[PDB]
Amino acid sequence: VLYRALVSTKWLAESIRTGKLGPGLRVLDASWYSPGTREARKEYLERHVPGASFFDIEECRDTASPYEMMLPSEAGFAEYVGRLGISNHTHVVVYDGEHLGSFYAPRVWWMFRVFGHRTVSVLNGGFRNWLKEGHPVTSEPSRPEPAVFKATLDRSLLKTYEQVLENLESKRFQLVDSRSQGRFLGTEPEPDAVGLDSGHIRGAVNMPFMDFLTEDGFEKGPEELRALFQTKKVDLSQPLIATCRKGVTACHVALAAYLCGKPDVAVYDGSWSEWFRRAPPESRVSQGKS
After folding, report:
1. Terminal CA-CA length for the chain
2. Rounded to the nearest 5°, which phi and psi values hold at 206?
3. Is 244 in the active site?
4. What residue ranges are annotated as transmembrane?
5. I need a labelling partner for 194 at 20 to 30 A (CA). Which of 25, 134, 144, 168 fits?
């Protein structure tokens, strides 16, 4: 029995405009951008949803690791969403002011889920549409009394390098690469990386995340989504893993899949940066280099 995965700006607005925000309702800006482009922390601090805290993905992740976007310990998470005054009784509303309409927020929506928390929704049309209707923004510091978070890892949403390599032969799981086509193919390079070829894993079907989002920034009608999948010969009845580069825009398929009525899309968090580096070259392909 799936909870609200999306909420409207109108809904969030009316909620904000009613001091519903607090230990019952907590808002997060997950915004992150490639170094030298934008700065979310800054942009957050300048304007954010009245009573919004900034979710920093560099701080809530497994830093010991040598791969991009690894989950922290249930501990590292619980301690963090703790200090953002989020218990397990609260409802979490995640946004980013990414241009497209969303990019990281679904990473976070997921993280929150994969840690056994089912009242989380992405704010639909991102900060983008929040502004596009001038919904009150503030520079005023959001300062939530910290809360205790029991954090329980649901494993079914998490696929590891080891499990993906198995599925390479098993074929029991459909494998979707949310990365932009240019790179699923090997045409384009991989950005913010050293000796990291582009190319997808043997069997990956490419469903770029851009294609889940109307021009206006909103997610698409589930009919449009349900097409999008079918049309990619991707069956929602059947077990489905989402890759990325780092395991972030993969969640975009997760959110999609979920909205359509499949809450059992797992995420390869290693994704391509892990795969590329750990896997034999034969388990992955690239138009160009072979």
Report:
1. 46
2. -90, 115
3. yes
4. none
5. 168
